[PDB]
Amino acid sequence: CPLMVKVLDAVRGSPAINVAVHVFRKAADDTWEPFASGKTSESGELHGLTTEEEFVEGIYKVEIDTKSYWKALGISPFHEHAEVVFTANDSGPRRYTIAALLSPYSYSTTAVVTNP
Amino acid sequence: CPLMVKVLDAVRGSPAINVAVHVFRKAADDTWEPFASGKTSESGELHGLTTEEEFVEGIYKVEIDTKSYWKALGISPFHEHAEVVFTANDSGPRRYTIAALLSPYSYSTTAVVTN
Amino acid sequence: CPLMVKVLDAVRGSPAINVAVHVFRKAADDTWEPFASGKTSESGELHGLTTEEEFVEGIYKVEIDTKSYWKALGISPFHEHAEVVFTANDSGPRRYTIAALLSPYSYSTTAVVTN
Amino acid sequence: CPLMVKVLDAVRGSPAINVAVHVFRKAADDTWEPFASGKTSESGELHGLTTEEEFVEGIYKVEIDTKSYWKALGISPFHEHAEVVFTANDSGPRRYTIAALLSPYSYSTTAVVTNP
Ligand SMILES: O=C(O)C1(c2ccc(-c3ccc(Cl)c(Cl)c3)c(F)c2)CC1
Ligand SMILES: O=C(O)C1(c2ccc(-c3ccc(Cl)c(Cl)c3)c(F)c2)CC1
Known about the structure:
Chains A, D: This is Transthyretin. Chains A, D: L-thyroxine binds at residues 6, 45, 108. Four copies of one chain form a homotetramer. The first copy, chain A, is mostly beta strands. Chain A has one domain: Sandwich (Immunoglobulin-like). In chain A, 6% of the residues lie in helices and 53% in strands. Chain A has one helix at residues 66-72, and strands spanning 3-9, 14-15, 20-26, 32-39, 45-46, 58-64, 79-88, 95-103, 106-114. In chain A, strands 1, 2, 5, 8 and 9 form a five-stranded mixed β-sheet that branches. A four-stranded antiparallel β-sheet of chain A has the order 4-3-6-7, covered by helices on one side. The N and C termini of chain A lie close together (11 Å). In chain A, 48% of the residues are buried. Chains in contact: A-B, A-C, A-D, B-C, B-D, C-D. The A-B interface holds A 59, 78-81, 83-87, 103, 105-113 and B 59, 78-81, 83-87, 103, 105-111, 113. Bound molecules: the ligand O=C(O)C1(c2ccc(-c3ccc(Cl)c(Cl)c3)c(F)c2)CC1 (2 copies). One ligand H50 sits between chains B (6, 8, 97, 99-101, 108-110) and C (6, 8, 99, 101, 108, 110).
């Protein structure tokens, strides 16, 4: 699992469950090509997005669908989504965890990058 | 001044000075069209991006060029840029401040929407 | 104005208005002695806490009464208060802004220390 | 494990290893009585602070020793520590995770509170 996403809710004090996440990878022509997608579990974690083979060097965008998540809970939030855009694997394969904490009008994200 | 951007630096404990910020509006074909841009001041603020008449309802993206900011300070950064994407809705209050706190592997952003 | 406090609300997307803030200085016996206090303004800011002559080097605690703030809004909060504890050191720049972003189960704080 | 602490470093993109944490509990007389302490592991996590029996109702302060952590890495940070003060177990036993993300001049903390 070289790409994981963990999301917490700062209003409820809970994992953020059933949050949709789409990952895109910048293509040869400079567009955002769909790469992987999935949704957070009961623990707020999203595993199994990709594999070591498929997760090659590139510029990736991890879009966390915070508006969808908040609307589902009956709340009108500010942002459309939270975006995390970064170059990956440019020194060889790393494992990345993108952690996010969500409020209706704010989010924070950080990355944990490990070398297996 | 319906739209202001204010950026802080969590490593130096200072405003984030001379950071490029580009704002885009989402066009009818779902592409992002340039809307306004500038560099943050000594106080980490960017005023004067737009006028009331120009800032209509719509989806906007504020891209903050964090990677060049950290490289100019000799610090190795994780992100290509930071992006804040939101709907401007006239039912809400009328003045939008997008605020961001930058670290090399992290950022936080919040909106302050007032009258 | 060597010391300013600015507080934002991540749930409402607004300044955090009428929040009580107490500042303490650490005494020689390691107890916290009252130093300054006030309530944030409509803009979420608290100016005028102290003067240059009064604000000496030392360890300070800024306690932000978040629990009463969230209860007055009818929201159930996690924390008793938020606390920011730091050393004021004259070798650094001279003006300290403590900024905080509040949520019911979370808060972030950063320092902006400038000349 | 009803009380856990997880700490990330926003400068390195890593767990924050070997971070000291002291927990205090407000006593009958209104002082802060030492309750438990420990340090984060290689994963940035601190387990085994307390037990279900000992972690009773009360007002707790979790002090994360961020100044010590940064000084050990050769960095002069702003804060003495990060403090998380909250009432616990006042509706019966819950499990709490206090998550923190640290920068030299900033920190963020959130709580995840679960009902076993
Ligand atoms: O296993 C992890 O990585 C978990 C975690 C999830 C989120 C956070 C965290 C805590 C604070 C902030 Cl501001 C952000 Cl962006 C992320 C954290 F510190 C830890 C505990 C869920
Ligand atoms: O005028 C404002 O709004 C300023 C400001 C700029 C940024 C922040 C801020 C502080 C903490 C976090 Cl996590 C975030 Cl996203 C933003 C803040 F609280 C305040 C103080 C300069």
